[PDB]
Amino acid sequence: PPHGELQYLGQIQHILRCGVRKDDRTGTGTLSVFGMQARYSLRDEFPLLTTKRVFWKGVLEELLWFIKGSTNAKELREEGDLGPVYGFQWRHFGAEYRDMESDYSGQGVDQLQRVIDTIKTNPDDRRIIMAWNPRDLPLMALPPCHALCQFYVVNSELSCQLYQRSGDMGLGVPFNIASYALLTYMIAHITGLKPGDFIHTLGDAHIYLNHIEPLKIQLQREPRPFPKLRILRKVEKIDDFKAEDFQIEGYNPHPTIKME
Amino acid sequence: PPHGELQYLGQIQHILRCGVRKDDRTGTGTLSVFGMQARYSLRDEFPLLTTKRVFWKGVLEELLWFIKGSTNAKELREEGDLGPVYGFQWRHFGAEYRDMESDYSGQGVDQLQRVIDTIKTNPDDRRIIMAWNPRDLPLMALPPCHALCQFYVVNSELSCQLYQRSGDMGLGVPFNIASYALLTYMIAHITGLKPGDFIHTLGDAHIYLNHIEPLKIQLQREPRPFPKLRILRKVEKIDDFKAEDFQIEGYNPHPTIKME
């Protein structure tokens, strides 16, 4: 059966051939297509892309920081306090922010624990849903999310669909595919399920004009078999995962590509 | 180029062959697949499905009622007051509900006017986003939406992506495809853009066990060319559209299918 990374390369090729010129926020140029989806199995493999070396260690450490609900940039204005932003929404959505050293237990909606609790109380549930760009929060009332992850459970397999309103294909998409797939493994481990599929849907799927040439070269590379992800200890709670619990194996990517 | 309805029939066939048994809320059985997408052009055609006669008149009238922000079931408990539900979220999200005859102007977020205003102030915007199942609102704090529509503008064409957390393939999906495509035409008309694509993404795409047999027969029918939708007057504001403004033409569907 075809390697799932072929989906990604195919999407790159489509944006190159068929994308239309469109400006971002800063007035920087992209090639853009509206509406795209790909599925990556998580069964006995882990979709760390192989056509370029993906920064696995950084994927892991940023996710653990999000999970912790941190607003202290330094854990990753002067003192490094980011305000009520990032994993603060995953773990304390809607709580009055005081400071990045304050204690927020029982304050706001914990979307993450809520997902895990529903998986356990009603696995059939169609509402197992959990992110905002920080810049958007004070910009308006009811500001639209950046990403929504929906989880789905059947035959003791956990699957995840991540819909992002925009996706930077060269830089963000690979990092995200690994990030939400890692989260899916974490939650599946703690709820006693097996990972199933990861589905990535995007609104404005785009390539920055600058990335066109390195991406053309990336396309001429052939995917190697996806690695495996091995969780090394039995872990009970989401907040208890540690970077040293995860081991990637059989990962043989092509060389790094630096994209602007 | 292949008729877009082939996407739909293909998805039916996939759920039949590959869907897994899964129970809904009421414990009724379905065949389910997680993660699906289809695109339907709106350029010089209107995706009213042709393999069964779709209730066009009802699509139109329910959308106009949603647009009006109504909570009076009778316009479509005793008196017929539904509470703060449906188009009330499209036009007054978050406003304190008093009654279905109260006046809510300037109260809550009007998502709909906000979409139209962004289309006009910044067409490049990646946040042009606007629905909840009524049953979910009081069930929890920060309750997940049922559907999110994202709009996208490029070369003076308006496109729409509707992501639904679950989709009833036999009954709901056709009705929705026509409903969001009609909304896209309405907004494109008022903002001086041309309709582009409608993309439908679903979380739990499912077929009710009861619909299996009529759907098997629907699959053996061949799509006819999509009709056209013609808006018959120049309309200035979204709230000014009337059912008599729309005419469907060249619609020759196969016979009605009644699904439970």
Question: Three-state secondary structure along chain A?
Answer: CCCCHHHHHHHHHHHHHHCEEEECCCCCEEEEEEEEEEEEECCCCCCCCCCCCCCHHHHHHHHHHHHCCCCEHHHCCCCCECCCCCHHHHHCECCCCCCCCCCCCCCCECHHHHHHHHHHHCCCCCCCECCCCHHHCCCCCCCCCCEEEEEEEECCEEEEEEEEEEEECCCHHHHHHHHHHHHHHHHHHHCCCEEEEEEEEEEEEEEEHHHHHHHHHHCCCCCCCCCEEEECCCCCCHHHCCHHHEEEECCCCCCCCCCC
Q: How far apart are CA B65 and CA B238, in angstroms?
A: 12
Residues of A noted as catalytic: 145
| A22:B154 CB<8 A | yes
Q: Which of B73, B82, B59 is nearest to B171 (CA)?
A: B59
| A203:B124 CB<8 A | no
Query: Hey, is B49 helix, strand or coil?
Result: coil
Strands A228-231 and A246-249 come out as antiparallel
How many CB atoms are closer than 10 A to CB B71?
23
Structure tokens at B135: 């049953």
Q: How far apart are CA A8 and CA A169, in angstroms?
A: 9
For residue A226, what are the CA distances in angstroms to A8, A37, A251, B142, B213?
Answer: 13, 19, 7, 37, 40
How many CB atoms are closer than 10 A to CB A198?
28
- Domain span holding position B154: 1-260
| A126:B161 CB<8 A | no
Contact indicator for A29, A43 with CB cutoff of 8 Å:
no
Interface test with B, best of A36, A164, A204 (most B CBs within 10 A): A204
The sign of the CA dihedral B207, B211, B213, B214 is negative
Contact indicator for B110, B91 with CB cutoff of 8 Å:
yes
Rg of the Cα atoms in chain A: 19
Q: How far apart are CA A107 and CA A240, in angstroms?
A: 20
Q: Which of B220, B217, B251, B249 is nearest to B232 (CA)?
A: B249
Q: How far apart are CA A55 and CA A248, in angstroms?
A: 12
Q: How far apart are CA A97 and CA A87, in angstroms?
A: 13
Q: How far apart are CA B206 and CA A40, in angstroms?
A: 20
Interface test with B, best of A201, A206, A208 (most B CBs within 10 A): A201
CA dihedral A70, B138, A145, B154 (to 10 degrees): 180
For residue A248, what are the CA distances in angstroms to A39, A49, A52, A112?
Answer: 20, 12, 16, 24
Residue with tokens 């048994």: B21
For residue B163, what are the CA distances in angstroms to A158, A224, A245, B236?
Answer: 20, 32, 35, 28
Structure tokens at A115: 């997902």
Contact indicator for A205, A11 with CB cutoff of 8 Å:
yes
Q: How far apart are CA A231 and CA A190, in angstroms?
A: 11
Question: What is the distance of C-alpha A110 from the center of its chain?
Answer: 18
Q: Which of A15, A3, A47, A5 is nearest to A216 (CA)?
A: A15
Q: How far apart are CA A131 and CA A127, in angstroms?
A: 16
Please indicate if any CB of chain A lies within 8 Å of the CB of B137: no
- Nearest chain B residue to A133, by CA: B127
Most distant pair of Cα atoms in chain B: their distance: 53
| A165:B126 CB<8 A | yes
| A161:B32 CB<8 A | no
Q: Which of A65, A110, A75, A70 is nearest to A92 (CA)?
A: A110
Most distant pair of Cα atoms in chain A: their distance: 53
Q: How far apart are CA B211 and CA A93, in angstroms?
A: 40
Judged by CB atoms within 8 Å, which residues 140-159 of B form the interface with A?
A: 141-145, 148, 150, 152, 154-155, 159
| B35:A34 CB<8 A | no
Structure tokens at B99: 């009654």
What are the start-end ranges of the H helices in chain B?
A: 5-18, 56-67, 87-91, 111-121, 172-190, 212-218
Contact indicator for A177, A198 with CB cutoff of 8 Å:
yes
Q: How far apart are CA A109 and CA B40, in angstroms?
A: 37
User: In chain A, which residues have their Cβ closer than 8 Å to the Cβ of B93?
Assistant: 142
Report how far apart the first and last C-alpha atoms of chain A are (Å, whole number): 34
User: A90-122: buried (b, 16+ CB within 10 Å) or exposed (e) per residue?
Assistant: bbbbebebeebeeebeebbbbbbebbbebbeee
Contact indicator for A107, A113 with CB cutoff of 8 Å:
no
Contact indicator for A181, A162 with CB cutoff of 8 Å:
no
Residue with tokens 């180029």: B1
Provide φ and ψ at A231, rounded to 5°: -95, 130
User: A5-43: buried (b, 16+ CB within 10 Å) or exposed (e) per residue?
Assistant: bebbbebbeebbeebeebebeeeeebbbbbbbbbbbbbe
Please indicate if any CB of chain A lies within 8 Å of the CB of B161: yes
Please indicate if any CB of chain A lies within 8 Å of the CB of B89: no
User: In chain B, which residues have their Cβ closer than 8 Å to the Cβ of A109?
Assistant: 141-142
Structure tokens at A153: 């459970």
Q: How far apart are CA B129 and CA B152, in angstroms?
A: 9
The sign of the CA dihedral B7, B8, B9, B10 is positive
Pick from A145, A154, A197: CB nearest B20: A154
CATH code (residue B165): 3.30.572.10
Please indicate if any CB of chain B lies within 8 Å of the CB of A161: yes
- Per DSSP, B243 falls in state G
Residue with tokens 């009861």: B210
Q: How far apart are CA A21 and CA A24, in angstroms?
A: 10
- Backbone angle region of B6, left / alpha / beta, with phi > 0 → left and psi within -120 to 50 → alpha: alpha
Contact indicator for A47, A4 with CB cutoff of 8 Å:
yes
Residue with tokens 């624990």: A113
Could you list the beta-strand ranges (E) of B17-130.
20-23, 29-41
Provide φ and ψ at A126, rounded to 5°: -90, 10
User: In chain A, which residues have their Cβ closer than 8 Å to the Cβ of B197?
Assistant: 34-35
Structure tokens at A118: 């529903």
Query: Hey, is B259 helix, strand or coil?
Result: coil
- Per DSSP, B122 falls in state -
Residue with tokens 């003192």: A79
Please indicate if any CB of chain B lies within 8 Å of the CB of A23: yes
Provide φ and ψ at A81, rounded to 5°: -90, 120
Q: Is B110 exposed, middle or buried (0-12, 13-18, 19+ CB in 10 A)?
A: buried
- Backbone angle region of A136, left / alpha / beta, with phi > 0 → left and psi within -120 to 50 → alpha: alpha
Q: How far apart are CA A114 and CA A128, in angstroms?
A: 8
Pick from B24, B154, B163: CB nearest A201: B163
- The number of distinct structural domains making up chain B is 1
Contact indicator for A11, A215 with CB cutoff of 8 Å:
no
- Nearest chain B residue to A122, by CA: B25
Task: Report the gap between the CA of B218 and the closest CA in chain A (Å).
Answer: 26
Pick from B23, B34, B199: CB nearest A34: B199
Residue type, B258: K
Q: How far apart are CA B175 and CA B212, in angstroms?
A: 18
Please indicate if any CB of chain B lies within 8 Å of the CB of A77: no
- Nearest chain B residue to A132, by CA: B127
Provide φ and ψ at B34, rounded to 5°: -90, 110
The technique is: X-ray
Reported structure resolution in angstroms: 1.8
Provide φ and ψ at A25, rounded to 5°: -50, -45
How many CB atoms are closer than 10 A to CB B95?
19
